[PDB]
Symmetry: C6
Subunit: 98 residues, 6 copies
């Protein structure tokens, strides 16, 4: 599975800026955003480990100027159970080559 | 794609005043508002880069008199993945010109 | 469009008292209330500029005795885009004379 | 219209005790409860003005022993627009006598 | 009606530990849990007064070690209006012997 | 019934890292995650008592590096009423062996 990048912000605007910067910096796909209430939202991007690493670093830098960044993290090889149980945009089995 | 303008406020009233001020200040379309819970809401406008910039600065000014503004930001050239994955009122492909 | 009055309270009871006082003080219609989570709720009334001004002032005075008022604001002539994009009870086109 | 009694608590348990105490203290009907997020909930009772006043004071007393009461308020003669626009268990027109 | 026991925790894990300890300590039924947002959740158990009293005391002791307990309370004889209007797992009339 | 493991975090990213670490550390199934609002989320894993214990300690370790962990707890032998009333991924009766 592709690597996993996540930028959590207590602020929609900052999360949007994180997402925009990430997809512009590297070959990663913004698959969606998670809403957990209380003003907390998370931008999720996926791609190769190198791409997700470069995107996440750029997303953090730019979002920090506009909003309240809660967390920034990269998971190079997410477990298949994680992708199946959590909404991260790469449901196992969703593949034409499968 | 149109430029993107956003005023985030922990308060519906302040966001409404922001939104009202933006569409009055320049030729921009208020496409809707995002609810992220915890009292956090974001007014979203779209238009040309010059127009959205003029709108947001007036919106920040107006919202600040009524509420606690959380974030104010403009993205002149938002990435297509962002408009596709996030609800910003400019879904790629939604155009009569095709 | 009719003028717009809004009383935001972090407390349902105080918001209800705001709403009750507003419709009693002047010729304005309580069109509903907006729920943005985190305990935040907003009472929305509409009517002529003078009526909404008198209502909002009475709503603020009484609500302040019972709850936590977040914001109080009046918009005399809300933009048509605001009424169309936001739930303020006067959707443009919803008129028998139209 | 019946008088309106309300006990708002940042805590479900405290609200439940408030509601229980109100309907036990006087001839009032617990019509339901409002959820505004952030842990905020409001118990709503309806009945004659004397009954709701007796209920709320007992409810405040009982809720205070269990939780953090946010607001306590009585509206003897609520405006018809309020009962029509807000969920208080006495929708105008809902009556067999017509 | 059976007695009513409630353990409110600002934390799902602590609420789960409360619920588990309660049903293990005495003859009470965990009927469900109430979600009021802001991280607030409440475990609700019902049974005879003695059983609910023993359960609630054990639920409080164990939950306090794991999470943030907001409120703990027992209602021996909840009013019929409470069980009808609030989701506490004993809707009046839901009985085969009725 | 399988043992129950839980990592609660006020942050989606920290919870995702917890969940990822748990299923990687031991033979446990991430059954899902609970959303209680206010930014609070809980990762839920099921498996043998030894496995879930190994998972949670690794999950706490991993989540703590990324976010603010709210609660960490293991229930070796959860009561059947808990699995029936709460969404923990092991509904009693859901078994081919019957």
């Amino acid at each position: 599975a592709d690597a996993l990048g996540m930028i959590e912000v207590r602020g929609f605007v900052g999360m949007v800026e994180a997402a925009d910067a990430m997809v512009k910096a590297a070959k990663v796909e913004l698959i969606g955003y998670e809403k957990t209430g209380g003003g907390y939202v998370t931008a999720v991007v996926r791609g190769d480990v190198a791409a997700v690493k470069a995107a996440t670093e750029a997303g953090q830098r730019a979002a920090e100027r506009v909003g309240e960044v809660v967390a920034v993290h990269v998971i190079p090889r997410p477990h298949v159970n994680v992708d199946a149980a959590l909404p991260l945009g790469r449901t196992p089995g969703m593949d034409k080559s499968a």
